[PDB]
């Protein structure tokens, strides 16, 4: 009875095999579970189809004469005031627009055949409030603007899904910064001052470490008893670790040395190695004990999944 035709925009149109009572072919398509209908002079699938939502919104599909382009418009019941408009080309490039209660543009997304896109939102004044550019490798830049058109926030996402997000104050200074690594862990910096110093939080799997940011380095700090562990992170992200114990007793005091070749901190008390804390490439920490002679590692390294286990290692 019908021939199904595939169109730009993952749409399908059904064309009657036979002409109807007139010199015309009947067209039906379902878009978002609303059936649209029309009639055309041609039997290729081109034409205009229309339907009406339950709430009296008018939906109009226009398929170009050569099937090179489809336009799908949703209007208010007046049939003129736009609610949304989607234009797709055969080469899979599209333009999707949403409109506010006035029928003025409020969002626009333009997608190219390679899947890169640009997205803009406009405020109730027709001013740009957000913009996101996504590249073919899936890297992106995202910007948000305030009412003065000043940059309020920016996020740069790399192809490996690592990212740097910044919030800016009215002096144009970074007040907050979040660095997300490709492993998914994050460094969060808040309260950034004019000298580039602030509070620092490292968000790891199962726990969070807290410390401070200077222009020189981030330092995260875990304290247990008289022992303090400091994880330093350089600007380029290199981790080094140190341990200080205030214990004055030669019998009990911990000291540690860091091997940056193995990313391992080895703790000694009373002349024997006691444990090795390895800071792995996936930003996790493992711990393994030396046998009571302090000269060989025993058992197996254990991956730390909670903050209490790091404290327990510093006992």
Give structural attributes:
palmitate, OM_lipoprot_Borrelia, Outer Surface Protein A, domain 3, 3 domains, 27 strands, mainly beta, 315 residues, Lipocalin, signal
What does this 3D model show about the protein?
With 315 residues, the chain is mainly β. It has 3 domains: 1-77, C1 set domains (antibody constant domain-like) (Lipocalin, Beta Barrel), CATH 2.40.128.160; 78-216, Outer Surface Protein A, domain 3; 217-315, Outer Surface Protein A, domain 3 (Alpha-Beta Complex). It has 1 helix and 27 strands. The protein has an 18-stranded antiparallel beta sheet, covered by helices on one side. Strands 23-24-25-26-27 form a 5-stranded antiparallel beta sheet, with helices on one face. The chain has a 4-stranded antiparallel beta sheet with strand order 1-2-3-4, with no helix packed on it. The longest helix is centred in the C-terminal third of the chain and has 8 residues, at 307-314.
Largest sheet descriptor: 18 strands, antiparallel
- Name of the CATH class of the largest domain: Alpha Beta
Question: Secondary-structure element sequence?
Answer: EEEEEEEEEEEEEEEEEEEEEEEEEEEH
Percent range for helical residues?
Answer: under 10%
Q: What's the CATH architecture of the largest domain? A: Alpha-Beta Complex
User: What name does the CATH topology of the largest domain carry?
Assistant: Outer Surface Protein A, domain 3
> What would the principal axes of the Cα set say about the shape?
elongated
- Counting DSSP H or I runs of 4 or more residues, the number of helices is 1
Number of domains: 3
- Rounded to the nearest angstrom, the distance between the terminal CA atoms is 81 Å
Structural class: mainly beta
Gyration radius, rounded = 31 Å
Protein name: Outer surface protein A
Organism: Borreliella burgdorferi
Pfam family, one: Lipoprotein_1
Main location: membrane
